[PDB]
Amino acid sequence: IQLLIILPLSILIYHDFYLRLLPADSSNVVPLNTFNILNGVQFGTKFFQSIKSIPVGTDLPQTIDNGLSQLIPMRDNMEYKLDLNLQLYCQSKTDHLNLDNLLIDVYRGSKDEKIFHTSRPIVCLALTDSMSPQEIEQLGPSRLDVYDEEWLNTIRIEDKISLESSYETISVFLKTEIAQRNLIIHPESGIKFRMNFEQGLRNLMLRKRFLSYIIGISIFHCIICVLFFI
Amino acid sequence: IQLLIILPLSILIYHDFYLRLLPADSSNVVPLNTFNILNGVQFGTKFFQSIKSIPVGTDLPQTIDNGLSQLIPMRDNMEYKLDLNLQLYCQSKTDHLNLDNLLIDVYRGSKDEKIFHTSRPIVCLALTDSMSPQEIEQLGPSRLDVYDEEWLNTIRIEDKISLESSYETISVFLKTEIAQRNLIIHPESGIKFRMNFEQGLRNLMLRKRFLSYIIGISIFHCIICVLFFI
Amino acid sequence: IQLLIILPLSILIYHDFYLRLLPADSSNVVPLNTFNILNGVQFGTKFFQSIKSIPVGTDLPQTIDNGLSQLIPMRDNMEYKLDLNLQLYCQSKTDHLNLDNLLIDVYRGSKDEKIFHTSRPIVCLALTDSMSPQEIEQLGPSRLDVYDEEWLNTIRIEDKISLESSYETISVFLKTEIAQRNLIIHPESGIKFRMNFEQGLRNLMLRKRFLSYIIGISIFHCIICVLFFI
C-alpha cells in the first residue's frame, strides 16, 4: 500500500489549485439567524437584511454564525447568485392538515420588486401523529434523529435568484397558504451568496464543492500514475 | 505480544507532552449548577454568574462541581472561547406539542450586550407518549436509560462564543418560543471556558481531548518502531 | 490445575495487606434508616442526624443496620468524604408526569450552611404504566425484580461532599421540583463516610473495594509465578 503516502501530495496541490481558481471570498453563507425577523399573519414571516457594499481591495469579511443581525457584505461591481438552503419543521396548531404548501417570496430594494417566487409542499406534524417503535429501531434511538430524518422539510433552491450589490435590502417571505402553522426554521438554514463567474465551470465547482474535491482527487490519480510509467 | 509493556512508556511521554503544551489550567468546565438561576415567563430561565479576574502567577483555581454558586475564574489579559454543553429534558405541561424550538441567548456585562443567539429544535415529552417493550429490550431495561438515549436533548455549541475577562457578568437565557414547558437541565450541563491560543493546533487539541490522545498514542508508534529498525 | 491450591495463599496475604494499609474503621456506611426523618411540603423530606466525635484510641464503632436513629461516629481530628448511595422509587400521585427532577441538598451545622447541591432526573411510576409480559420473561418473573431493574432510580454521588467532625449535625434534603410524588427510599440507601487519606491511592482503593480485590489478586499472580522461574 504505497498509495497512502502520495495521496496527501495530491490533495494538497488540488486544494491549492482550488483556492487559486476559486478564492475563499467567492462564496458567503448567510444564515437566516443573522437576518431581521418580522412576523405577520397576512405575509407569514419576513427575513429582511440590508446590504453593505465595500470597494475593491477591501478583504470581504465572512458572516459570523452568531445569530446576530449583520449586514450582508457583497463586492460593489459584482453580480451574485443566491442558493437558498431552508430546513424547517411544520407543526399544525389547528385543523391538523398533514400536508401544506409553503410560499417562498424573495424581494429586493417603487418600494420592493419581487425577483423570485416558488411553492414547496411541506409535511406538517399533527397532534394525532405517533412515532412507532419500528422507526426508533431503524431511524436511530433518538427522537430528534427520527424527526430530522422523517419530518424535516428540506428546501434547496440554487442558481435561480440573481442579486446585484446596487440594491440595498433583500427580503425573504415564508408563508403557508392553507392554514397557519408553527414553522421552526432549522438553525443551519441560510442563503449562500456566490460570485457568478463567466467561465461556467467555476460556477459549477462552487455549487458542488464536496463533489468537486472527490472528482479532482480522483482525476489527479492519472497524473500520479504517469510519473510511474516514465 | 511485546507491545503491551512499551505502550505505557509512550502514553506517559505523550501525557507529559500534552501537559507541557496545554497546561491543566487552560480549560475550565463550569456547570450550570454553579450559576445563579432566575426563572421568568417572558424570558424563560436565566443562567447568570459574575466573573472574577485574578492576575498572572495566581494559580487559576478550578470550578468545584458542588452545585453552589461560584464566581468564574478567568485570567485577566486573556480571551476565552466558550463551549456550551447543554443536555435537557423537555416535558409538555400544556398543549402537548411534541416538538418545540429552544432559544439560547448569551449576554455579557448600556446594561447587557448580546453576543450569541441560536435556536435548537427539541423534542418534548407528552402525557400520551408511551414506551414500548421493544425499546426496553434494546435501549436497556432501565427506564431512565431509554429516556436518556431517546428523549434527552443534547445541545453542543463550540467555538462560537468569545468572552473577555474585562466583562463582569455573563448570562445565558433558555426559552421555548412555542409553549411553556418543564425544562429539566441535566446536571452535567455546563460551559467550558477555553484559552484561545494563537497556534491554532492547540485550540483544536483542547476541543478534542479524547480524540487527541488516541491520535497521539497512534502516531508515536512510528517513533516506537524506528528504534527497532536501528 | 495446580493454581487452585495456591490462590488461597495469595488472597489471604492480599487481604492482610489491604487491612494493614486500609484499616476496617476507615469507612462507615450509615443507612438513611438510621437518620431522623422530617417530612415537609416546601422542602420535601429531611434526613438529619447528629454527629458524635470520639477521641483517638477509642475504637470507632460501626453503624448498626437496624433502622434505629444512631449518632454518626467520626474521628475527632479527621476529614471525611461522603459517598451518597441513594436508590428510590418515584410514584406519581397526581399529574402523572413520567419524568421528574430530584433535588439533593446537603447541609451541616448562622444556622445551617449548604455544602452540596445537585439535581438528578428520575423516572416516576404512573397509574397508566403497564408491565408487558415480554418484560416478565426477560427481566425475571418476579414483578419486584422487573421494577428494580426498570423503575429503580439509582443515584450515586462519590468524592464530592467533604465533612469535618467539628460540625454537630448533617442534613440531607430530597425534593422533586415539578410535582409532589411518593418517594420510596430503598432500605439499602445510605451515606458512606470515608477517611480522606493523603496518599491518593488509598482513597481510590476505598472507593473501589470490589475492583481493588480483583486487581490485587490478578497482580499477585506475577509474584506467584516468579518463584516458579527460580
Author numbering:
A (entry chain J), B (entry chain A), C (entry chain B): 24 to 132, 145 to 265
What does the paper say about this structure?
The structure of Sei1 was determined to a resolution of 2.7 Å. The Seipin ring is assembled from 10 Sei1 protomers with a diameter of 140 Å in the outer and 25 Å in the inner rings. Sei1 protomers are characterized by an 8-strand β-sandwich capped by two orthogonal short helices (α1 and α2) at the inner surface of the ring protruding slightly towards the membrane side. Besides the luminal domain and in contrast to previous studies, our Sei1 structure also revealed regions proximal to and within the membrane. On the outer diameter of the Sei1 ring, just underneath the β-sandwich, we observed a short helix parallel to the plane of the membrane (α3) that sits on top of the two TM segments. Although the two TM segments are encoded by amino acids at the very N- and C-terminal of Sei1 sequence, they come into close proximity and show extensive interactions in the folded polypeptide. Proximal to the luminal face of the membrane, Y37/Y41 establish methionine-aromatic interactions with a methionine residue (M240) in a short helix (α3) in between the luminal β-sandwich and the TM region, hereafter called locking helix (LH). In contrast, the helical region in yeast Sei1 luminal domain is split into two orthogonal small helices (α1 and α2), and does not extend into the membrane. Furthermore, the Sei1 α1/ α2 region is enriched in charged residues. Coarse-grained MD simulations showed that TAG fails to concentrate within the rings of yeast Sei1, consistent with it lacking a membrane protruding hydrophobic helix.
